[PDB]
């Protein structure tokens, strides 16, 4: 999903 964007990444802790 969002491994490069840390914001999107932190928004969805269960996934990358």
Swiss-Prot record:
Both tyrosine sulfation and C-terminal amidation are important for activity and structure stability. Keywords: Acetylcholine receptor inhibiting toxin, Amidation, Disulfide bond, Ion channel impairing toxin, Neurotoxin, Postsynaptic neurotoxin, Secreted, Signal, Sulfation, Toxin. The modification Sulfotyrosine is found at residue 15. Residues 4-6 are annotated as: Ser-Xaa-Pro motif, crucial for potent interaction with nAChR. It is found in: Secreted. Disulfide bonds join 2-8, 3-16. The keyword Nucleotidyltransferase does not apply. The modification Cysteine amide is found at residue 16. Belongs to the conotoxin A superfamily. Alpha-conotoxins act on postsynaptic membranes, they bind to the nicotinic acetylcholine receptors (nAChR) and thus inhibit them. This native peptide blocks mammalian nicotinic acetylcholine receptors composed of alpha-3-beta-2/CHRNA3-CHRNB2 and alpha-3-beta-4/CHRNA3-CHRNB4 subunits. This is Alpha-conotoxin EpI. The lineage of its organism: Eukaryota, Metazoa, Spiralia, Lophotrochozoa, Mollusca. The chain holds residues 40 to 55 of 56 of the full protein.
